[PDB]
């Protein structure tokens, strides 16, 4: 199916002394492959997946250079944005940046993205066509004029449409044993009674990859959203994900309810029902 490569970066200022805390993470789909933490002892981009360990010194040197450059740009930015917003030197502020590319089943470029935020709010982002920018306020508009004059969009577009895609294909090929493998959810239903007239049915999906999944309930073959609770998809910690969906039902009527599970690893969606 589809794939993506995305990098996330977070810089938090330390106004009383020193440089900001900078954490960078890179993903292929739902798999973390590299990380950089300014508080770590290596001061190097580090591997987080076995398939990236085969890259040589040249690659690690390159990634470390580029990531340090990203941290210094955020360092400067924190000061520049502090001024744009007339803020004092006493508080801690955050800059977040996320960029990457999506590809289709054929591995060809689908779309690219580059978003930047200040204190958790939109700041500036590249538009879908990758040729212009969306600035949320007048400070971000000052950045947009800088970026237009320095032709930043052109540079990014070339990276997003080309380089990003090329590296994503290299990674999918090198990590094929896991990256190109889909792990279907292991499903089961549990039952719980709170009183003599009400019961809860919980449909579980475990050990799946990728994270995208759809869990839905039906009553007599009709979709049912009322009286349902769906938890956020969560990581199991071994690279797979979990999620559950519950429906509250009149005790004794459990057999009318069915859980439906949709996932890339299932050649056909599955249905679960509670037996007596």
């Amino acid at each position: 199916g589809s794939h993506s490569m995305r990098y996330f970066f977070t810089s938090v200022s330390r106004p009383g002394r020193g440089e900001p805390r900078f954490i960078a993470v890179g993903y292929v789909d739902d798999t973390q492959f590299v990380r950089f933490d300014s508080d770590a002892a290596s001061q190097r981009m580090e591997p987080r997946a076995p398939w990236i360990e085969q890259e040589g010194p040249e690659y690690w040197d390159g990634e470390t250079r580029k990531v340090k450059a990203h941290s210094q740009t955020h360092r400067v930015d924190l000061g520049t944005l502090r001024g744009y917003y007339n803020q004092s030197e006493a508080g801690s502020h955050t800059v977040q940046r996320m960029y990457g590319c999506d590809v289709g089943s054929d591995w060809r470029f689908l779309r690219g993205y580059h978003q930047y935020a200040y204190d958790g709010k939109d700041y500036i982002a590249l538009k879908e066509d990758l040729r212009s920018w969306t600035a949320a306020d007048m400070a971000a508009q000052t950045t947009k004029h800088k970026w237009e004059a320095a032709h930043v969009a052109e540079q990014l577009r070339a990276y997003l449409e080309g380089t990003c895609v090329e590296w994503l294909r290299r990674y999918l090929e090198n990590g094929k044993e896991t990256l190109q493998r889909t792990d279907a959810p292991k499903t089961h239903m549990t039952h719980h009674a709170v009183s003599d007239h009400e019961a809860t049915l919980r449909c579980w999906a475990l050990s799946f990859y990728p994270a995208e999944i759809t869990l839905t309930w039906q009553r007599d073959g009709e979709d049912q959203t009322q009286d349902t609770e769906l938890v956020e998809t969560r990581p199991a910690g071994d690279g797979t994900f979990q999620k559950w969906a519950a429906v509250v039902v009149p005790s004794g009527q459990e057999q009318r309810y069915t859980c439906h599970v949709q996932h890339e690893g299932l050649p056909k969606p599955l249905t679960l029902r509670w037996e007596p």
Binding site: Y7, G26, Y59, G62, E63, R65, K66, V67, A69, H70, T73, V76, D77, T80, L81, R97, Y99, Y116, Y123, I124, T143, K146, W147, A150, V152, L156, Y159, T163, C164, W167
Partner: peptide
């Protein structure tokens, strides 16, 4: 691989 060589300052 990351975007390079050096992200433009805001």
């Amino acid at each position: 691989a990351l975007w390079g060589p050096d992200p433009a300052a805001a």
